[PDB]
Structure 1
Amino acid sequence: AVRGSIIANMLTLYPYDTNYLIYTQTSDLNKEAIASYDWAENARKDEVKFQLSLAFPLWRGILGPNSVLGASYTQKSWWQLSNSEESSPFRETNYEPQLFLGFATDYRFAGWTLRDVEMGYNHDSNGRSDPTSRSWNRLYTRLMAENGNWLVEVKPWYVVGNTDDNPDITKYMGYYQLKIGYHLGDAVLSAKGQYNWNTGYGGAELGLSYPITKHVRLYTQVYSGYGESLIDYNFNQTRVGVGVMLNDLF
């Protein structure tokens, strides 16, 4: 089985990243970037945030017994539920589809065991038009290794193609994302961050989850920093939220 291995599992729908629904409250709401929306001025700091993440095997065995041509779809949304006055609109959705090539490996080194090696294309959108449109594409490599109750993932990338809606996004995002998971009994502690040294901008996301049932977990999240979403890429905030989860990191 190997817990947390996206590619191994991938070799009923398949999860990719985590899936979850939480009720959040942000330290501040970026009214500036969404000022062109009629409702923008009466925007509240409490939103429902949720994420879906599916993985789809397209061609298993394309380069051997442990490889796969695959695709994923991760979608995050921030919803102004409590804002009944404006018709509880969606503030923002990020659509993040990937086309990739992944390997279920077993390369051991220093007690660690590298289990996923994945290389592909990444497109990340917010589906809006001008002037609220946000977008960037990336060639990345996702690398995951395990060690007992530890899981560590590193996903470096190279920004490719056009970035006109957010030229300087890479200034706030960085060139890689780092995940740390920890298995305290059935509780999963998780750390998700990215940071650009040359600029000093970045952001982190802490998390704690515990099962209620075989398919549902209690979950709490704390995001703090830049780039929580595309429309808030150049905007800092601390958001905290509580809700439910299907699958975590492992």
Structure 2
Amino acid sequence: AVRGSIIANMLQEHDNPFTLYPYDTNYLIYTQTSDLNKEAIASYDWAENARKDEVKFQLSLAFPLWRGILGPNSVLGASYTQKSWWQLSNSEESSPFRETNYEPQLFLGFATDYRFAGWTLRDVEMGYNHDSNGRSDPTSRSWARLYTRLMAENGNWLVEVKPWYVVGNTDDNPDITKYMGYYQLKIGYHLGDAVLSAKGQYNWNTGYGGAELGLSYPITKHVRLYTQVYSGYGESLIDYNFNQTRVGVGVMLNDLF
């Protein structure tokens, strides 16, 4: 059961306060994109010398703020997630960071046990999300969402849906919905210790969207070899309206399950 189940995991108490909880996946991979969006970041010095090969990484942690707030198997929690695109090899430019996306959340989560013809709905999570790239104009992007996260498992499968509703200011990128849509779908499949996964969003009206396929395998007890292939719009905020295909290879700690 407790395999990829975020909320139930947060409920399990740690003896050491400095032992964190994983929310999303944690990885650092060496990537190569098909197109490096220069239009958007043109304001930057290095902009011209921008290379199509960046070190991409994602950090993702959850913090239980208050267990049992709404009954047993409930938690008022927070998570922090950060994706970074880093022109590491771009030595002529002093290895700049092209983009970072800071994504903190505040939610009410529940660990559950509903049945769906084989499936079990394990997580039901409802919260506020903020995602900005901490840039001063013009390369500044930001948007906010009220969201619901639902995860269910059934054998080697995991399915998580995340519908959302936009709230707050969207001026840095008013039309962001046109590229992101109204929800995120995520599928994981366990083939032994190999984990195949897919994560995506798609605005069924505008035809815009994006996908991310992944495959990982344990290098050791805690670290995995991870291969990623992103294609489409919205890889990062600064490229939300930019299309691209990105293949990368690197290491991972936790996968979706």
The answer to whether TM tops 0.5 is yes
Query: Could you tell me how far 1:73 is from its partner in structure 2?
Result: 0.2
User: How far apart, CA to CA, are the structure 2 residues paired with 1:10 and 1:197?
Assistant: 34
Query: Could you tell me how far 1:41 is from its partner in structure 2?
Result: 0.7
User: How far apart, CA to CA, are the structure 1 residues paired with 2:193 and 2:174?
Assistant: 42
Query: Could you tell me how far 1:110 is from its partner in structure 2?
Result: 1.5
Query: Could you tell me how far 1:215 is from its partner in structure 2?
Result: 0.5
Partner of 1:166: 173
User: How far apart, CA to CA, are the structure 1 residues paired with 2:195 and 2:59?
Assistant: 19
Query: Could you tell me how far 1:161 is from its partner in structure 2?
Result: 1.2
Q: Per the alignment, in what secondary structure is the counterpart of residue 48 of structure 2?
A: helix
User: How far apart, CA to CA, are the structure 2 residues paired with 1:233 and 1:239?
Assistant: 14
Partner of 1:216: 223
Q: Per the alignment, in what secondary structure is the counterpart of residue 10 of structure 1?
A: helix
Query: Could you tell me how far 1:2 is from its partner in structure 2?
Result: 1.3
- Is 2:168 the counterpart of 1:156? no
User: How far apart, CA to CA, are the structure 2 residues paired with 1:200 and 1:208?
Assistant: 26
User: How far apart, CA to CA, are the structure 1 residues paired with 2:119 and 2:222?
Assistant: 29
The counterpart of 2:135, out of the listed 128, 140, 145, is 128
User: How far apart, CA to CA, are the structure 2 residues paired with 1:110 and 1:216?
Assistant: 34
1:57-68 matches, cutoff 5 A: 57-68=64-75
Structure 1 residue runs without a partner (length 5+): none
Structure 2 residue runs without a partner (length 5+): 12-18
User: What's the TM-score once normalised by structure 2's chain length?
Assistant: 0.97
Query: Could you tell me how far 1:35 is from its partner in structure 2?
Result: 0.3
How many pairs align?
A: 250
- CA deviations on 1:88-108 (whole Å, 9 max, x unpaired) are 000000000000000000000
Query: Could you tell me how far 1:162 is from its partner in structure 2?
Result: 1.0
Partner of 1:189: 196
User: How far apart, CA to CA, are the structure 2 residues paired with 1:230 and 1:51?
Assistant: 14
- CA deviations on 1:136-191 (whole Å, 9 max, x unpaired) are 00000000000000000000000001100100000000000000000000000000
User: How far apart, CA to CA, are the structure 1 residues paired with 2:91 and 2:39?
Assistant: 21
Query: Could you tell me how far 1:52 is from its partner in structure 2?
Result: 0.3
Name the % identity.
100
Partner of 1:82: 89
Query: Could you tell me how far 1:111 is from its partner in structure 2?
Result: 1.2
User: How far apart, CA to CA, are the structure 2 residues paired with 1:109 and 1:224?
Assistant: 32
Query: After TM superposition, where is structure 1 displaced by more than 4 Å over at least 4 residues in a row?
Result: none
- CA deviations on 1:29-55 (whole Å, 9 max, x unpaired) are 000000000110110000000000000
- CA deviations on 1:16-36 (whole Å, 9 max, x unpaired) are 000000000000000000000
User: How far apart, CA to CA, are the structure 1 residues paired with 2:34 and 2:219?
Assistant: 29
Q: Per the alignment, in what secondary structure is the counterpart of residue 172 of structure 1?
A: helix
Query: Could you tell me how far 1:109 is from its partner in structure 2?
Result: 1.6
Partner of 2:106: 99
- Cα RMSD after superposing both structures: 0.5
Partner of 1:198: 205
User: What's the TM-score once normalised by structure 1's chain length?
Assistant: 0.99
